[PDB]
């Protein structure tokens, strides 16, 4: 990436849309599955499109990873839709979820952590005219800190490794 | 496998099965996109789709993800020697799904009808891209186009 990225501004509706965010990843993680959640937000007015959790072990699925699975949630929808909105999501995004982001043209991306899990998509997204955020919320590191230190091999597995 | 630009053994293969998928959701009404994932070490088809869109209400099973979900989970190793077939050009989101699991090769029907700044990133990222400009396959993408435009900008995110 370029050496002038910055971090984007803070949104009005940063907390609410992280917090249901890890809201959904710990509703994974109790269900047996990877702890990543997400939410995908209108900027404008804080309206919920949608929300939504990795379903790796509850469906057996290669590609719902929590930002898939947000989108999935959200339904199908009209490509101005997603025009000013902010999808959360509990870890920095791989390069499948980056790419998601990228093509429906959501314009920003608040993550919650990139100290246990970051691919080149966080720097990707600025390069292709998206904003980031990190906040680095603890309770995200935690629960998928614990996660991967339990079942590394179901980790690595939807990482592709 | 390094085809250093020869074509695979498995490829017309692959490309005739996505083909077929594409042709099977032009028939249930959806958008005419199809794909399979090959083991390049034996040949097996690992898992075929199409989009579904229509089918399902699905906004992200493009026919590349349709493709690996329908393969079912995998052991990481097993992607990076397979081929992923597809009718047409990969959008952003299906680059990244086949960056991300490392599947070395992608093998695109056409890229006439639509192609993204994914078909070069797959380049950048270390990829072997293959276009092969199948006619059947630009001519069902071409008639979805034409009659139903809007149904496939939505696809797209337009
Ligand atoms: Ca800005
Ligand atoms: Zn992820
Ligand atoms: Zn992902
Ligand atoms: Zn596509
Ligand atoms: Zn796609």
């Not at 050496?3 to 249901?20: E, Y």
């Not at 007015?45 to 699975?69: P, W, Y």
């Amino acid at each position: 990436g370029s050496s002038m990225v910055t971090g984007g501004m803070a949104s009005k509706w940063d907390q609410k849309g992280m917090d249901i965010a890890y809201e959904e990843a710990a509703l994974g993680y109790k269900e047996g599955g990877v702890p990543i959640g997400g939410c995908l937000i209108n900027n404008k007015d804080g309206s919920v499109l949608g929300r939504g959790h990795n379903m790796r072990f509850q469906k057996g699925s290669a590609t719902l990873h929590g930002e898939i699975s947000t989108l999935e949630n959200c339904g199908r929808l009209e490509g101005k839709v997603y025009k000013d909105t902010t999808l959360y999501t509990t870890l920095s995004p791989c390069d499948m979820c980056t790419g998601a982001i990228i093509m429906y043209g959501i314009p920003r991306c608040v993550v919650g952590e990139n100290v246990n899990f970051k691919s080149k998509g966080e720097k990707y997204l600025q390069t292709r005219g998206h904003e980031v955020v990190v906040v680095d919320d603890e309770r995200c590191k935690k629960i998928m800190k614990q996660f991967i230190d339990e079942r590394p091999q179901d980790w690595f597995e939807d990482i592709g490794e």
